[PDB]
């Protein structure tokens, strides 16, 4: 009966708790964290992934995107236009310039209103999807380059690399840069570490009301829905929290600060924006709980070469009793979004 409100939880592990990543994810799930779709973990003070960020101004952002937003009344579509390569130095100059910098504000609620008031104006540049990592090679705790989860079975058995999914991405943000409503590819988990800069704000719908958000999205954008079941996977759809309130979709809000991790959980819809110049690192990962989510993930079919993982390896290894049934197409398992991952048993005994 854990986290019955399904609110976003924040955790403050000691360095001892922190060390084993998979095991801490099982712990937070034993506390009900997954029910929110999104959780915050504040790493211990003594922890640091990089001694300094003084040297990265020469790093290349090979395909920055200008974010053109169209819409009104809490409903928008974002078009992401690939601009020419620029350096982090070139990006920071634009980010902090009078034209693109963060407006003056008092309370977060004020910055949030300005975001929803102004997101269709003066399209910003998001330095998104940059292959690479800012962790130093020796960093053994919560290293996004090597978290050591069962997602590693993809590369271990097939040799398949999916950039961003089983490798890390860097994201350089400026004010009013946005991520649209979405779950992860194959409904995996994600991890996001805010290396530096101004905050990133998040909205999250609980996985248990996820279908409700899809039904509503389908109604607001019926053309997009009629031509692709999984159109939210296109990552173009922005919906304000006032609209979510108006139609009864439970959601939570959270602001991530420099030095904080966010975890997103399978089928946890999330969206948000950056406050100003910052840098985040992200990848996906898995637990045993994810396997059923992966078997049932509704995928985008209308775009070529979208992210699709063979589940075969995972069903054979962790669900050998159900493999023949699954392969016949007769595995009718119903997901219970409240249940924690099997690995949490250690913490519930």
């Amino acid at each position: 009966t854990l986290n019955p409100s399904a609110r976003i939880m924040t955790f403050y592990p000691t360095m001892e708790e922190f060390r084993n990543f998979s095991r801490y994810i099982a712990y937070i799930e034993s506390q009900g964290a997954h029910r929110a779709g999104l959780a915050k973990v504040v790493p211990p003070k003594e922890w640091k992934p990089r001694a300094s960020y003084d040297d990265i101004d020469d790093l290349v952002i090979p395909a920055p995107i200008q974010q053109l937003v169209t819409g009104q009344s809490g409903l928008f579509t974002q078009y992401n236009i690939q601009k020419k390569a620029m350096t982090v130095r070139e990006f920071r100059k634009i980010a902090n310039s009078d034209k693109y910098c963060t407006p003056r504000y008092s309370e977060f609620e004020e910055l949030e209103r300005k975001y929803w008031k102004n997101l269709t104006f003066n399209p910003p540049i998001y330095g998104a999807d940059v292959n690479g990592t800012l962790y130093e090679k020796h960093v053994d705790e919560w290293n996004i380059g090597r978290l050591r989860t069962i997602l590693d079975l993809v590369e271990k058995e097939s040799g398949i690399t999916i950039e961003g999914v089983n490798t890390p991405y860097l994201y350089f943000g400026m004010w009013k840069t946005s991520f649209a409503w979405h779950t992860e590819d194959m409904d995996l988990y994600s991890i996001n570490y805010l290396h530096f800069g101004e905050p990133k704000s998040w909205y999250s719908v609980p996985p248990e009301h996820g279908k409700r958000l899809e039904r509503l999205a389908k109604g607001f954008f019926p053309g997009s829905a009629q031509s692709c079941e999984a159109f939210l996977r296109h990552k173009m759809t922005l919906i304000s929290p006032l609209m979510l309130k108006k139609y009864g979709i439970p959601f939570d809000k959270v602001t991530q600060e420099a030095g904080e991790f966010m975890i997103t959980f399978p089928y946890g819809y999330h969206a948000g924006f950056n406050h100003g110049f910052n840098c985040a690192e992200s990848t996906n990962f898995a637990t045993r709980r994810w396997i059923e989510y992966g078997k049932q993930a509704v995928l985008c079919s209308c775009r070529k070469d979208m992210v699709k993982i063979s589940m075969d390896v995972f069903v054979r290894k962790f669900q050998p009793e159900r493999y023949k049934l699954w392969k016949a197409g007769k595995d009718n398992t119903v997901i219970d979004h409240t249940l924690p991952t099997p690995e949490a048993a250690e913490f519930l005994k």
Partner: peptide, 8 residues
Amino acid sequence: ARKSTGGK
């Protein structure tokens, strides 16, 4: 074959 922030 790769993760993307979003399309057009």
